[PDB]
Amino acid sequence: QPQLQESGPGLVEASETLSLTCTVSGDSTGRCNYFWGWVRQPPGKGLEWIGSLSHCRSYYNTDWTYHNPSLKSRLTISLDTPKNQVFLRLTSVTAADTATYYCARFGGEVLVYRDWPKPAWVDLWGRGTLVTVSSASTKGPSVFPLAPGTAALGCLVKDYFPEPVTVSWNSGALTSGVHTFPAVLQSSGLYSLSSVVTVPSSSLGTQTYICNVNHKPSNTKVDKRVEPKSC
């Protein structure tokens, strides 16, 4: 089957330019059958249309370009049909433009239409490429305690870059009841995550609980003792 392959930088600094190329194989972008364009998906969120365009060989005019209105002012999409490539350029980016970007082939009322073509559905998707937007340099985490039948306690692991961090408890001696969550990318362009463990309430006065945070990209390890609150 045909393939759409995205290429381009996976990390772009804030207010700078996000550029991607899509290389089409096994089909020709110079057909009047389809539009070519882009869709993105922020981590943990839904799909968002970016836009699509057409430029086919014909005896009439076939140049059409449609953009998502909320992106248009900083959006350029283009086709180089001889190279069988589609291009995306998004300027003035912020962390909020962090997303998996998908090359997309759109069908609909395209070849035969009334008034204007109406590409409506994507029948071929690229694998997708994750582009993270942050101006951060490598930075180790700050670690704060989430202080506590059973009780939950944890560590809030803040403001690090890039991914990933890993977390253990009591140098690995505490594994039962542990859950470490996925990170969130914050508007600062830094990540945070939490790690939690559920333990017996009766152990809080007498058992020591330390989270061990490893951030290999910054060669940082942080150990944080989590104590019961004074109230």
Partner 1 sequence: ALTQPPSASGSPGQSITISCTGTSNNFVSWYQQYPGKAPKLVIYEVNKRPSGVPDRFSGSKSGSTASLTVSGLQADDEGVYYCSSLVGNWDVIFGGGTKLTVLGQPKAAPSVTLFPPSSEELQANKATLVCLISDFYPGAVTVAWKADSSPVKAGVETTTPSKQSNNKYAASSYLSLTPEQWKSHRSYSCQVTHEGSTVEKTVAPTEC
Token pair belonging to 100: 């998996």
The Cα angle at residue 226 between residues 221 and 231, in degrees rounded to 5: 150
Q: 19 vs 188, which CB is nearer to partner 1?
A: 188
Q: 17 vs 183, which CB is nearer to partner 1?
A: 183
Closest CA to 78 of 59, 98, 97, 64: 64
For position 61 contacting partner 1 by CB under 8 A, the verdict is no
- Which of the ranges 21-29, 83-91, 166-174, 191-199 carries the binding residues for partner 1, by CB under 8 A? 191-199
CB of 158 to partner 1, least distance (A): 8
For position 196 contacting partner 1 by CB under 8 A, the verdict is yes
For position 147 contacting partner 1 by CB under 8 A, the verdict is yes
* Size of the residue set binding partner 1 (CB under 8 A): 47
Tell me the Ramachandran region of residue 164: left when phi exceeds 0, alpha when psi lies from -120 to 50, beta otherwise: beta
Q: 18 vs 39, which CB is nearer to partner 1?
A: 39
CB of 181 to partner 1, least distance (A): 4
Q: 59 vs 116, which CB is nearer to partner 1?
A: 116
Residues 80-139 that bind partner 1 (CB under 8 A): 102, 106-109, 116-123, 125-128
For position 189 contacting partner 1 by CB under 8 A, the verdict is no
Residues interacting with partner 1, by CB under 8 A? 44, 46-49, 66, 68-69, 102, 106-109, 116-123, 125-128, 142, 144-147, 152, 154, 156, 158, 178-179, 181-182, 184, 186, 192-194, 196, 198, 229, 231
